[PDB]
């Protein structure tokens, strides 16, 4: 499962998390088996304006 979010919100990508990213964008199972992998992409995704 693949997406972009701001650095602050990366904490919401874990089991039992809450807030508008977890609850209204991407919700994990409480008992999820898996890996969560993230990297800063300011050099790939930010733009002037």
């Amino acid at each position: 499962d693949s997406f972009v979010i701001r650095g602050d919100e990366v904490r919401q990508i874990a089991p039992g998390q809450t807030g508008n990213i977890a609850d209204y964008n991407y919700k994990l199972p409480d008992d999820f088996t898996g890996c969560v992998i993230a990297w800063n992409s300011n050099n790939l995704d930010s733009k002037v304006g």
Binding site: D8, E9, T18, G19, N20
Partner: protein, 50 residues
């Protein structure tokens, strides 16, 4: 206040809403003990000290 001289307000006789607090990303930490933050809105208390 300064940390050696911490300032306490008794909160009483009012209805709270802790969702206004725990939903906000403004807080560089939000750690709770003996309660879950998302569970605060179901409870009542004798007083709160801030």
């Amino acid at each position: 206040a300064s940390v050696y001289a911490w300032n306490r307000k008794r909160i009483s006789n009012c209805v709270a809403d802790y969702s206004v607090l725990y939903n906000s990303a403004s807080f560089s930490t939000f750690k709770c003990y003996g309660v879950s933050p998302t569970k605060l809105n179901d409870l009542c208390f004798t007083n709160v000290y801030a």
